[PDB]
Amino acid sequence: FPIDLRGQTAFVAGVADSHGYGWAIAKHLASAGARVALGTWPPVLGLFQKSLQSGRLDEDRKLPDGSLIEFAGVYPLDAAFDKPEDVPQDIKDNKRYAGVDGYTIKEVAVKVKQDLGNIDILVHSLANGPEVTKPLLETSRKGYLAASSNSAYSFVSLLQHFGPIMNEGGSAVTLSYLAAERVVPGYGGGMSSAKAALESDTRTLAWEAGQKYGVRVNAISAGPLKSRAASAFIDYAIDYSYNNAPLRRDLHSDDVGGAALFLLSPLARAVSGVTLYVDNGLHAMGQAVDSRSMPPL
Amino acid sequence: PIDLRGQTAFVAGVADSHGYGWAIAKHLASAGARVALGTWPPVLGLFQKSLQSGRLDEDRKLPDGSLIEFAGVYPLDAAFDKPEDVPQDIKDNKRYAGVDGYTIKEVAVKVKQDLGNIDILVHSLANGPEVTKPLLETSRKGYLAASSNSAYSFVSLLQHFGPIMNEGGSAVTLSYLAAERVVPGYGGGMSSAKAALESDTRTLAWEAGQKYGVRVNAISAGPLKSRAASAISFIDYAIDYSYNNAPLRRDLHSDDVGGAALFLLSPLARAVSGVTLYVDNGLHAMGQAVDSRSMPP
Amino acid sequence: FPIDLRGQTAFVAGVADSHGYGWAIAKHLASAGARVALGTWPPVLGLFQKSLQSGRLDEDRKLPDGSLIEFAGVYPLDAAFDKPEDVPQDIKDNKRYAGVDGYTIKEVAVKVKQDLGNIDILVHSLANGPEVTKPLLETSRKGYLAASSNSAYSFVSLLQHFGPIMNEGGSAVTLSYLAAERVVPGYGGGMSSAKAALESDTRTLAWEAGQKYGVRVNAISAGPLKSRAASAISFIDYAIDYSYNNAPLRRDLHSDDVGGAALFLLSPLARAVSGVTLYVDNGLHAMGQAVDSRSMPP
Amino acid sequence: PIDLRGQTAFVAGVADSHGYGWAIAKHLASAGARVALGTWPPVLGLFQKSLQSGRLDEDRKLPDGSLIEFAGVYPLDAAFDKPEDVPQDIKDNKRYAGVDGYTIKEVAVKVKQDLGNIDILVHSLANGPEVTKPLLETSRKGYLAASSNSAYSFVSLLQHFGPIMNEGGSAVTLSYLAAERVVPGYGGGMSSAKAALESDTRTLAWEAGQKYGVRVNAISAGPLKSRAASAIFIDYAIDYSYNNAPLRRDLHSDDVGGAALFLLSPLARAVSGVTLYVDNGLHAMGQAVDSRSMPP
Ligand SMILES: NC(=O)c1ccc[n+]([C@@H]2O[C@H](COP(=O)([O-])OP(=O)(O)OC[C@H]3O[C@@H](n4cnc5c(N)ncnc54)[C@H](O)[C@@H]3O)[C@@H](O)[C@H]2O)c1
Ligand SMILES: NC(=O)c1ccc[n+]([C@@H]2O[C@H](COP(=O)([O-])OP(=O)(O)OC[C@H]3O[C@@H](n4cnc5c(N)ncnc54)[C@H](O)[C@@H]3O)[C@@H](O)[C@H]2O)c1
Ligand SMILES: NC(=O)c1ccc[n+]([C@@H]2O[C@H](COP(=O)([O-])OP(=O)(O)OC[C@H]3O[C@@H](n4cnc5c(N)ncnc54)[C@H](O)[C@@H]3O)[C@@H](O)[C@H]2O)c1
């Protein structure tokens, strides 16, 4: 009973495989009784649908009680585009987009409304920075703005188009990273700047959507995870966290899944505009404890 | 999703059903935990009488219709760490007659003997004898009493309970926005004590996370008409301000903080430590009041 | 002697009149002995140069000693463009841009290098959000990205192109606002998000430029000022009133107050200061509650 | 640009030339302020003698070649607000022999009598008797002594000097990053006291801004090999900062002296309630760059 989401509907944007935070969030929402629909980047939609229907993901879909999560629909969604007239001709003609239609944010919200009705829960678990491996001193304007469009404005647009079909008391969460607030070398390409914008937008939308729709908006600042996007260096980031955080333990995608479930549930009915660290306590440290400036183990 | 059956909690600072301590205890019991209370000795008799008379039956009532039951109600004076610290005047004070073994160290010993190791520790207690005084009119003695009762008491609770907490266990304390930004009327060095308390939450997250594998977090709550608050009408203005200026226009109930504390003290929060979680209808996010006399109605 | 900038050169990007923060920063730098060159948005360059030459600005140029500030040059600069190839044809042909050349960030840094040599001090005092009056729920992708391009990435680009000609121990400063950290109704169009990205880039560039160039990078989070930009959007008046009535220091905020704080951050007095956001706002940032709320008694 | 001639400063917590207090006092005097000092009474004799002997002549030398002179050096024990707070064993301690009128209230009265109103107030003093102990091993008595000596002392200084400060005057205190994020080894409840001190800086900025028109700010400083620091490791903290901060450079006491001069001057007339980091940019970092988890 403490977290009962039966009768509620969730839309989770940014799920293309079982290895990232988006999958873990969707799995927790389903285990708590929510109907869960997914938005998936259209070029990888076929591969994802194929891996679901083949039974290759059946282990990753397994719930504590032994049943398998089922999705209320898997919708193609490209969060770089708000409406059909924004999609350039090269994209519409791109073979990777052949045989999918209606994948702009506005069109997805219309389909969800038609197929499922009003929703209660909105998840933004997507990011893309084409110049992420470049330091900010070597990042182009185009790379920097692509990071911001894909990773920060996509959350604003999701709220603009889903907000109108969200029930009062409903909730939205996005994922961020400590680089928004403090310098993490290697998180380049204007991704740090985009995550800072995204946390600022979390607060501003908490105000705007709180007033207009009675909807809560929060962020989780997560620690490092070997997702498919991250492994495409991530190994060093995870070792650093393991060796320097208050809690000496592995960070699992389920750890963020569980924290998202809270922020998206009635337990969190007074919580809005927060950045909740889910990173084994690392955000609290003012000094590495394994620095070569200090004595060893 | 939150199953605390088999776990034991100790909630320090519960003397009635109107405060945040009671609401947290109630949420822990609804999720299956055994819950013991620590109560300031002069009001222990009154509280025990209220419980036993049935006066609190409505307040004890869960969703399923059972009433919460406590595994023990212990006298606890968080001003005193060991029996040697208790002055003769206190031992002889009539308000302490018929109660024994109420220092922090003694209570932790009794809990270990009666209940065994605990998983969950809650510090929901504060006392500022000069809280109505601005900081420019607060004496050293009043300021230090605020810090002793409200900040150091959390450190001492962790020092004495930490050794009897299971690995993976968790502690939470309660703070207020005045720790980070100026709230006129929260005086007597209570703002300073809450800043110390939030800093200690981080420091203890590191020390207790390393030493005990215990998580330590804080909730920064909004205004609530508790018995402590209504005795100081000012609490009424602070509530009105929040209602009129927060992202979520709704009443803030003690249950709202109870639900958030339940999360932080549960396995869903297994990667969360050292945080200050705002549970305040989003107010913390605002940079301007919206009902200022400087702006149009 | 405590702030002596004689022998140093500053470039101040985003000065088109005497009513904004950029002018006050330039004026303080000059009073401390720095040579000061300006970057000015090309469409308003003609009007600005005419004002300077006509004597209209002589009172605003006046220093405490009674001399008038002089600029080591006034350069057309459009901080939306990094290189000549980025400029679209409809801009090159726009009548507002007729008669000016070489105004991209890279070309301005080249001209500064050629005309003045290396610099010590860099100021970014420019922002532009075409949808600033729109709430975030009504702000388009195009307006949100223009706000970021003009107001946040422009600082990154300035450091990338001026960094190689900045002396070790040099210093850069930008201007932000509280809306980057907490919600201020009416600061819309993705400008709050752009200022958050700008403060984050201030820290990241402090690391990158501190390691590579030994250059310091800081931000000032300023209070409300009735500049030409602000009064063109009576909203700035309400924001000013709110600050006056709710801040720890009950006093008017003058552009010179930010000018003095920038002079510190850009001087050898600040040699150990980098990556900060310094509030210059009469203490308003420190407040957790308005004191003239209708929820409270008068 | 910064001209403090005609202004008067009181700098609490100067007992030698190696700490931040001295550097702030030196910068204030170079800018033309008259500077009085408050000195912990048990080291007052040694400090006065080192001044009068000429031993401090190099450290007193200004850029132009004159030596700073103080408007007076007052005994001050910031653990005590008024005479009746001082226990008998302190009054009788030989270290406090021959010194009188050293509670905060008394010093403020003497300053007003000797010098008149002041413009500038500096709090550069801390003491945590249990600083080497982790918080899980810190006693209540040790924790409260850290708070009394290091946080409340600033509140008391404003309460007693506030009434003799000119409108537009200014106060500054010194903090450290341990107030906001965990620094192992900064124990004894000193991290907690620095957090309370930063919070009090904000609350006093409001209270003293409204009542007196006085600005109140804090500098969060990096590690410095002062006498207090070398008595306690400080070498490891300094190395860490050198190897991990944006600016790879030594942090000198004059770096904080310069930043304090700014906060205490008319250039900062719109600045109040801030925590200004003067630490080579280290506060901005979210990761060490010489961690053994990463490659050399
Ligand atoms: N260490 C980490 O992995 C880490 C740390 C902190 C935060 N995060 C954040 O968590 C979120 C999830 O990341 P993950 O690493 O689990 O990645 P992931 O492997 O789930 O990849 C990111 C997802 O975004 C989707 N995506 C990218 N561009 C898209 C677009 N235009 N339209 C629709 N979908 C798009 C991708 O298809 C993919 O599903 C991200 O916002 C990321 O920044 C990740
Ligand atoms: N508006 C509010 O009520 C408000 C706002 C934010 C935070 N909080 C925080 O929530 C916590 C609980 O507050 P509440 O308002 O619900 O109070 P409450 O009415 O429960 O009173 C505080 C509790 O502390 C206990 N206590 C005080 N001194 C004690 C001692 N020496 N030993 C043992 N117990 C002692 C009291 O007996 C009482 O149970 C406090 O830390 C408070 O600062 C309250
Ligand atoms: N209340 C305020 O006025 C206020 C408050 C806080 C911060 N700020 C910040 O202070 C800074 C200066 O603002 P101001 O209000 O003093 O403005 P201002 O009137 O000087 O206008 C901003 C300047 O930016 C220049 N500019 C705009 N787009 C440009 C481009 N593409 N290329 C080159 N220059 C361009 C304009 O020509 C103008 O000189 C801005 O960053 C602003 O966001 C202002």
Ligand SMILES: NC(=O)c1ccc[n+]([C@@H]2O[C@H](COP(=O)([O-])OP(=O)(O)OC[C@H]3O[C@@H](n4cnc5c(N)ncnc54)[C@H](O)[C@@H]3O)[C@@H](O)[C@H]2O)c1
């Ligand atoms: N690494 C560092 O040295 C460091 C780092 C950050 C912040 N700080 C802060 O800077 C300030 C000055 O420290 P420093 O290391 O330059 O110190 P220091 O060596 O000047 O010693 C501290 C001073 O405080 C004085 N003092 C202590 N207790 C006193 C009392 N009860 N009454 C009056 N004076 C008393 C001492 O006599 C001494 O003058 C302190 O607040 C310190 O916490 C220092």
